[PDB]
A paper describes a structure:
Based on a literature survey and a preliminary activity screen of heterologously expressed potential para‐carboxylases, 3,4‐dihydroxybenzoic acid decarboxylases from Enterobacter cloacae (EcAroY) and Klebsiella pneumoniae (KpAroY, 89 % identical) were selected for further studies.2d, 13 Both enzymes belong to the UbiD family and are related to a ferulic acid decarboxylase (Fdc1), which has been shown to facilitate the (de)carboxylation of cinnamic acids in the presence of a recently discovered prenylated flavin (prFMN) cofactor. The AroY monomer consists of an N‐terminal prFMN‐binding domain (residues 1–339), an oligomerization domain (residues 340–475), and a C‐terminal α‐helix (residues 476–495). A comparison with the previously reported structures of the fungal Fdc1 and E. coli UbiD14 shows that AroY structures adopt an “open” conformation, where the position of the prFMN domain is more akin to that observed for UbiD, compared to the more closed conformation observed for Fdc1. Crystal structures and in vitro reconstitution data unambiguously demonstrate that prFMN is employed as a cofactor, and that oxidative maturation is required for activity.
However, upon purification of the decarboxylase from the E. coli host, only little enzyme activity could be detected for either of the two enzymes, despite additional co‐expression with the UbiD‐associated prenyltransferase UbiX to provide sufficient prFMN in vivo. A comparison of the KpAroY and EcAroY crystal structures revealed only small differences, in accordance with the similar activities observed in solution experiments.
Numbering used by the authors:
A (entry chain B): 4 to 491
B (entry chain A): 3 to 491
Amino acid sequence: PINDLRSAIALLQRHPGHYIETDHPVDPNAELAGVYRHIGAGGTVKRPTRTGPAMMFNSVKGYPGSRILVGMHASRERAALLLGCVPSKLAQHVGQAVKNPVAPVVVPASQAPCQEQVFYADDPDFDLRKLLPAPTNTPIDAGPFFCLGLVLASDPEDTSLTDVTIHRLCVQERDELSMFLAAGRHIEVFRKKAEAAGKPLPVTINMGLDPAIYIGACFEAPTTPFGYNELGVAGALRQQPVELVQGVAVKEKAIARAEIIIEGELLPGVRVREDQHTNTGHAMPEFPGYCGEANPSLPVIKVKAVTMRNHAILQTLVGPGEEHTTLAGLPTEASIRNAVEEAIPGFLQNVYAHTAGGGKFLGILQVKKRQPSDEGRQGQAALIALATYSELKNIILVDEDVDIFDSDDILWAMTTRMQGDVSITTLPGIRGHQLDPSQSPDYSTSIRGNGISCKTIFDCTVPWALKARFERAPFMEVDPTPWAPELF
Amino acid sequence: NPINDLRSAIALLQRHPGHYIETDHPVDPNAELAGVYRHIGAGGTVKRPTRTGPAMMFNSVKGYPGSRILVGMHASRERAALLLGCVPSKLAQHVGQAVKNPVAPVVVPASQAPCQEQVFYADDPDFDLRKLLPAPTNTPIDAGPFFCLGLVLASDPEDTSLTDVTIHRLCVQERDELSMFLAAGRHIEVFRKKAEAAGKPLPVTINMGLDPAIYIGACFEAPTTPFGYNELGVAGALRQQPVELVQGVAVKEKAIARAEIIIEGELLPGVRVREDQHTNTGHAMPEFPGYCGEANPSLPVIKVKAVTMRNHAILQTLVGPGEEHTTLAGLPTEASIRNAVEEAIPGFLQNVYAHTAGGGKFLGILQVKKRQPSDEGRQGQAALIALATYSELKNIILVDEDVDIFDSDDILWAMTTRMQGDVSITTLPGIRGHQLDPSQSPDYSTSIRGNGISCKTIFDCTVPWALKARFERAPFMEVDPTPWAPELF
C-alpha cells in the first residue's frame, strides 16, 4: 500500500512513463523549472510544454546529497493512478472520501520517519539557504520558493481548533521565511489572535507527502475536537489514518511520514517585502499563467528547527501548470457536482475544471436532457456552478456525447452546436478573481474594480426538440486490440 | 528514395516509426473496418474515443483475399508535413509556395503506366465491381459501399483543351454502376451539362491510390492552360518531377499513370438515382462536421467501362472523414486566408489554423502580432478578411503570437484570461455558411432565414495594445532539456 511519498513513487515505477530520474546536474535557480517546462509542467505554462512524468533531480548544483522532485501531481492520469480510480471519476472518488473521513492519529516519534535527522536553528552554523535547495520558477521571482508546504496550525486560545492548508513560502534569511495567509482562513484568524496579544503562532510546514494528503487537504472539511480534519480525506482514501507526531521545537504537530518538516512560528508585529533581496517587483508565476506581483507586506516565519528523514526528498512544483490544476480543480469539480446533483438529480453527467483556467476560471459541464422538461435546465446548472464557485469565469455546457476532457471536442461543440446570438449569455459586474488580468476597468467599462469580470455561459447543448438531428456518426462498436495489440 | 506514388510514400513512413502499421487480422469492410480505425487514427470530428495515429494497411479483408485496404494516409498534420519535407506549422506555406510555381504533367505510354498492369473490361458478362474492389462502408447506416478518395479527371466534351481534376466520393450501386455527386459551378459539372444536352455521355477516369502530394495539391485553386490538368502542377512542383499521365484504355480521358486503381466510366445522360436506393437508410455518409449526411435524391450515374489496377493493388480511402478531411480541406483554407491577409496587412498575420474541430472549414484560428499602436483594430480586419475569403467559415478566434494555435488547451486559455464576453465577442447574423452545419437552421435561431445560413462570431482574444505590458506570460529560462532526459528527445 501507499502511506508516504516514497511508496507512491514505487507504484509509479510499476507504470512506465509516470516517473523518471536524472543525474545530470541542475541549478535550482531557474534552471530546474526551465527544464521541467519542456517535460511535464503543462497547464497554463507557455508552450512548448506537455504533461509528462514526475521528475527527480538527483544532482543539485550547490546542494550535495539533496534531491528535488517536481510534477508529482502534474497529471490527472497520474493522480487517479495514485488513488486507484478512473481519471474521469477522480473527483467523484475523492468526494466520496470527503463524506466518510478517517480521523488522523498521534503516534510516537519512533514511528515518525520525518525526525530521523534534526537541525535546530540556534546552532550558529545553521542556514536554511544551505540546508534546503528551494527552487525558483523564473529568473524574476522574489526569491527561492517552497510551493508545497502543508501548513498545520492551531488556535492559540483553544488548541482543539486546527487548520490544514497548503501555502507557498519565500526564503528570506538564514532562519526566516515569508508566508502569505489568505484573509478569512482559520490560520490567519489564529495569527491575528496571537499578534493581538503580542505572541507568536507556532506552525509546521510539512513537505514531501502522500499525494492523498495534498489532494485531500484542498477540500473543505467539517470540524471536530482536535480535528486536523482535512487529513481525514487521505485517511479515507487509504483506509489508514494519517499519523501525526509532536513537533521537536514548536507547540504544534507534524506529519509523521513526511520527507521534510520546517518548524517555526509566525512572528508578531513584523512585515517584510516579498522581493526585498531581488527587487524584481514580482513574486512568482500564478496559476493563470502570468507573473504575480510581489506582496509588499508579508508576515515572517521564524524557523526554530528543520527535521527530515535520511536522504530527504524535497518536493515542490513548477508552473504551477497542471500541478495546480489537479490540486485546485478536483475540489472545484466536487463542489459543483454536489450542488447540481442536489438540485437536479441525475442531470449532470460530469464536470471538468479545465486546465486552461488552472482548474478555477473555466468550468465545463456535461449534461444529459432525458425529458422535455430538461430543456432550460442546462442554464440552471450553469447558474448553480457559478453560485457554488464564485471564482469561476466562463461556463461551457455540452451533452453526454462530448468528451469534456478533449479540448478539440469542446471546440467542436462550440462550432456545430452553437449560435452566437442565441447560445451566449453574458453576466457583467460579477466578482471573480484578482489574478485574471483582463478583470480590469482598463479592459471593460462595465468593470468597476480589479477582480470584477463579465461572466459568460456558452450553451453548446442541443435544444431538446432537435436532438434527433444532432446524432454523431455512429461507428460500429469493436475492440481494436487484435488489429494493433501494441497500441493497447 | 524520391516519392512518385503511394508505395514510395509508404516506404518513407516506414523509416519514421509511428506513422504506418499493418495488420493481418481479418477485418470486415462492412462497418467493422471503419470501427477499428476510429479508435486508432480517424481523429477529427469523429465521436470519442478517437485520436490521430498511424496510417493503416489492412492486409486481410474478409471475403477479399488478395485485397488490401489503406486508410489514414492524410489523417495527421505531422504525417502530411513529413510526406512533403517541411515542418507542420509551415505546411500551408510550403504548399502555397509550390502552387505558385507548378510543374506541368506529362503523358507517357502504357509502358510506363503501372496503373495498367491489370485491366478488367466491363463488357465481360461475369464482370462485377463488388467482386473486384472491397469498397468499405463507414457506418452500418451508410447508403452503400463508398470510395472516398477518387481523383476524377475530365475534359470539356467540346473543347478538350479544357480540363478539370477534382476529388469526389462514389457509392457502389450495381455491378457496373456508381453514383457520384458533383458540385454545381465547377468545370466538370459544366462539362457534364453540355454532354447531357446533346444526349451524349461524358468520359471520366477515377484515380485512386496516389502520391499524397497529388491528393493534397489537387484541393488548391489552379489556373487553366491548354491541356493543362493544372491541379496536378502542385504535386509536380512538390516533387520537382512531373506527374505522369497515361491515355485511357476504354474511355476518352487520361489517367494517373502511377496510380494504384483506375475506374474508367461515363456519366450517363438523363438517368438519375437516389444514393440509398439499395439500403433505404435515408443517409449517405458521415460528413466532415461529424454527422451522417442525408442521401441525395437525384445523383448522376457513372457507368464503368473498365477497371484498371497494378499488381496487388492497394485500395486507398478515408475513415471519419476525421483528420484526413481536415488535412485535405484545411490546408487550402489556411493558404488562401494567409495570402489575403498578407496582401492587405503585410507582416501582421503570423499563422492560421483551419481547426480540426471545424473539419478544416468551419473554425478559423488566427495568430497576429501587434507591433505598433496602429495595429490595434487590425485584428478585426484580419477576421473580416478571412470570413470574406472563405465564406464557409463560421467562427474566428484571434490570438497573439505567444499562443500555440494548434493547442486547443492554449486556445481556451486565451479565451479565459484574454477575453471579456461583453467586450470581445462580435456576432454577425444572417450570413450564409454551410448546409452541413445542423445549427444553421431556422429552428435553431429566429435570425436564420434558411438552411445553410448562420450567425458568425468573432472571438477577439488578443491583448489590447495598451495593456500588452500586463499580459506577459511567465518567462521561464530557455534551456535544452535533452541531457536531463535524452529518451524523451
